[PDB]
Amino acid sequence: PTINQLIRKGRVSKVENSKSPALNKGYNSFKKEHTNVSSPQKRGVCTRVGTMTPKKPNSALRKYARVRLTNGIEVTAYIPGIGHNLQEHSVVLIRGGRVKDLPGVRYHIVRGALDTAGVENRAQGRSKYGTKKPKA
Amino acid sequence: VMTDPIADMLTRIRNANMVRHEKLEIPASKLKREIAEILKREGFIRDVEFVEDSKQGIIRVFLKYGQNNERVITGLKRISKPGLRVYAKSNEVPRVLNGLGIAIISTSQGVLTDKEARAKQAGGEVLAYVW
RNA sequence: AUUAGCUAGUUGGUGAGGUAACGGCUCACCAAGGCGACGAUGCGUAGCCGACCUGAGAGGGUGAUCGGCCACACUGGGACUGAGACACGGCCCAGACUCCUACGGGAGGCAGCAGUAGGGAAUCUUCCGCAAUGGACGAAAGUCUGACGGAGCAACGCCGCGUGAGUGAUGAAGGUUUUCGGAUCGUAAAGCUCUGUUGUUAGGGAAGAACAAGUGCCGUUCGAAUAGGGCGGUACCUUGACGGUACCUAACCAGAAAGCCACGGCUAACUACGUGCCAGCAGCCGCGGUAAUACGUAGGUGGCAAGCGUUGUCCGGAAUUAUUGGGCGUAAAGGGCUCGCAGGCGGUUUCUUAAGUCUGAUGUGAAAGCCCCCGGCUCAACCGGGGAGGGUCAUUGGAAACUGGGGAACUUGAGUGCAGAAGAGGAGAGUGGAAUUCCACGUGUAGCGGUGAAAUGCGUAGAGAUGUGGAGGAACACCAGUGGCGAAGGCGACUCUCUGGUCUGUAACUGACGCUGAGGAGCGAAAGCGUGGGGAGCGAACAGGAUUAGAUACCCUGGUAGUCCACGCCGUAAACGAUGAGUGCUAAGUGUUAGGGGGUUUCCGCCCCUUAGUGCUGCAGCUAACGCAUUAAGCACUCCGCCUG
């Protein structure tokens, strides 16, 4: 609008969140607080691995991890591969991936982590899902 | 109230273009009288006339319709609003409609056009845009 | 600003001390100031800058390396010597911790180079050399250099080169697909010919290295001196970590060497099997319950290349915070409306001033980097040379139209006088007239009352209807009308007292005195609240009779608060023109409320001109469409609020 209206209020600029909140904060022990690291990827510990359903028209039951990171925050992640490898108390590296279909989980588990061996018999999609080149 | 004198004379020229009136009345201050000679001397007015009255004076404009149905003045625009004083320098003299249009510039050495401010190389206030 | 009050050595003065130096810097005295809506104090946050990245530019993000400066040296405090510190590898003290002790005592500080622990998604070699650059001291040689010089690690990134190349149709073989004719993997292989970047072998072997120092002279300078020097010139001599590394020379072989991603639409590229809401894809729309070009596989394409994808970041596209570069009738958005301090903006004419503005000159914004142009490295990347650019910069000298300031005039803006006219504008005390009920009574009998139907309620104690009379409240027909007036909410019986603004008529006056207005102030229907007053109708809550599968509802007869009054408070609504206030301008036609001017007319009247609200149909233009249209949502401008799915 008018100019003197703009000067003593300013343009109140638009603040946007991240694509995933639980990658943006790290932990340090003896400080006993909750640092702002903005690291991409973290290694986490699974606690409960049950499975459940997606929400709507797609109805085919998913894999539903629940992982606990090194920040201290327990965020349910997702297992992408064709069948899993994980059991309780494992090493789980997490990249930022949005799952529209499942309610609440916004974290893939990197199939191909330190503990996640690659999915069985996969040729296409080699870099994803952690499989080596089979034989050359 | 009236808030500025030059705004309500330029749009009054513009609001006569959509009806194609022959003549106008503008209450004719000093810088109002000198804008009209600029448009007269450079192809936008048939003839301009001064009226000496007792109240405040009136200046009147014969609009220039030289061809079939083709308004020479196709729009005006006042820039340096009272609260935004566009001081374009002499290095960066704003030419409008690049090749075609004029902008009236009030300089320290008279209220000039683009050209008379250009070669004399002195800038200042920029009071209007003219298509 | 979901931090509005904060500071007493604070803030002032005087003197004193103290500091290299000015000082409440320290202390005495005396004073009460200072800091603040331009946001103090506080709190969370963070080293700053040339610059980096991005954007077309305006801007936005980041402040790593290299270059500037400050701060810190386990945490904290003091202090010495020294030109310079409150000292990164110095002292003294405590705090934690490590190490040693014969327990009395001591020593220690890697955010120096490396390296390790540990943290974490994650970051490198415990090398060589002082040859060059640098410093340190010394008369010099020299000495000392984890500055630096190079080597080593990781595709970490940019750039540079490969991974064979010509010929070769037979469209080989094989693979995949198939309507079994074929199609494609295709000149792709084989064959033939080919060079050797690099790979491999053997050789040659830079510049970086300039020197110092010592010798030689000549010049000059001191000198008791041709002693002996000093510098200055030239002359000889001598000095390599990288490293026999780059490099070049010749010899050798297609021999050493390509992958990941995509393939419905965005988006370049598709088929076959598997599969059957399951397994699984997914950035977006969304794909699969039996023919999945979207899942998985295979073939075949396409993408880019020593890399490719995914991931988290920041910018962009995002005009989607809009200064350049939006909105507000209904899409997100006008404050309910006012009176207004601060802040914001300014009629006309003229003199003057130069704060803003314009412009020169000078000084400066180091270098590297961006950018202009050359040159160097086998080109490139990189590096070098020169130049520009970058400052709301400072001083100085100019310009006077516009803005700010000052001096003086004009009257249209606004206001005052005066002469009118309109009014349900407000507040006050009082006044009636129908009508409802209540009650008194006459007259008079079986029901009225009520609904979709009916019942509850009322009635032989005399209702209802009807006649007079009485109390009492609240509402004020008719006039009544996109009619009046107020800023809005709102105000309709009547009269009086008191009081606000409105509009016309000019001209008598003032000489811009105006508009808007964050906070602040006051008003603001109905509901509700507290204290009493008053309670005839009406009437939430509740009760009853029906209705209904249910009726905590619509209907039904009652019925409490309420409404009503004075006084105090809440301060909200579709507080609506879903349109913030003012100023001008932009075809008409048309009523209608109040005027005024005229034209024949005392008229009535008609007609025309004209201010002000008040409505409707309409042109240009605005609008996404409906619509809006001199009462704008047209074109412009000043101010305030509001919105960013």
UniProtKB/Swiss-Prot annotation, chain A:
Family annotation (CDD domains): Ribosomal_S12
GO molecular function: rRNA binding; structural constituent of ribosome; tRNA binding
GO biological process, one term: translation
Cellular-component GO terms for this entry: ribosome; small ribosomal subunit
Region described as Disordered: spans on this chain: 32-54
Keyword entries, A-Z: Antibiotic resistance, Ribonucleoprotein, Ribosomal protein, RNA-binding, rRNA-binding, tRNA-binding
Highest taxon in the source lineage: Bacteria
Alphabetized InterPro entries for the sequence: NA-bd_OB-fold, Ribosomal_uS12, Ribosomal_uS12_bac
Annotated site location: Not modified: 101
Purpose: With S4 and S5 plays an important role in translational accuracy. Interacts with and stabilizes bases of the 16S rRNA that are involved in tRNA selection in the A site and with the mRNA backbone. Located at the interface of the 30S and 50S subunits, it traverses the body of the 30S subunit contacting proteins on the other side and probably holding the rRNA structure together. The combined cluster of proteins S8, S12 and S17 appears to hold together the shoulder and platform of the 30S subunit.
Family per record: Belongs to the universal ribosomal protein uS12 family.
Assembly and oligomerization: Part of the 30S ribosomal subunit. Contacts proteins S8 and S17. May interact with IF1 in the 30S initiation complex. Interacts with BrxC.
PANTHER family: 30S RIBOSOMAL PROTEIN S12 FAMILY MEMBER (PTHR11652)
Anything else known: Many streptomycin resistant B.subtilis with mutations in this protein produce increased quantities of a natural (but uncharacterized) antibiotic. A number of substitutions and deletions can promote streptomycin resistance, dependence or pseudodependence; all but one of these (K55R) are associated with hyperaccurate translation.
Protein name: Small ribosomal subunit protein uS12
Species the sequence originates in: Bacillus subtilis (strain 168)
From Swiss-Prot, chain B:
UniProt entry tagged with the keyword rRNA-binding: yes
GO molecular function: rRNA binding; structural constituent of ribosome
Transmembrane segments: none
Annotated Gene3D superfamilies: 3.30.1370.30, 3.30.1490.10
Nucleotide-binding as UniProt keyword: no
Cellular component GO terms held in the UniProt record: cytosolic small ribosomal subunit
Family matches, as PROSITE patterns: RIBOSOMAL_S8 (PS00053)
Keyword terms of this UniProt record: Ribonucleoprotein, Ribosomal protein, RNA-binding, rRNA-binding
SUPFAM superfamilies: Ribosomal protein S8
Complex and partners: Part of the 30S ribosomal subunit. Contacts proteins S5 and S12.
Protein function: One of the primary rRNA binding proteins, it binds directly to 16S rRNA central domain where it helps coordinate assembly of the platform of the 30S subunit.
Family: Belongs to the universal ribosomal protein uS8 family.
Protein name: Small ribosomal subunit protein uS8
Organism: Bacillus subtilis (strain 168)
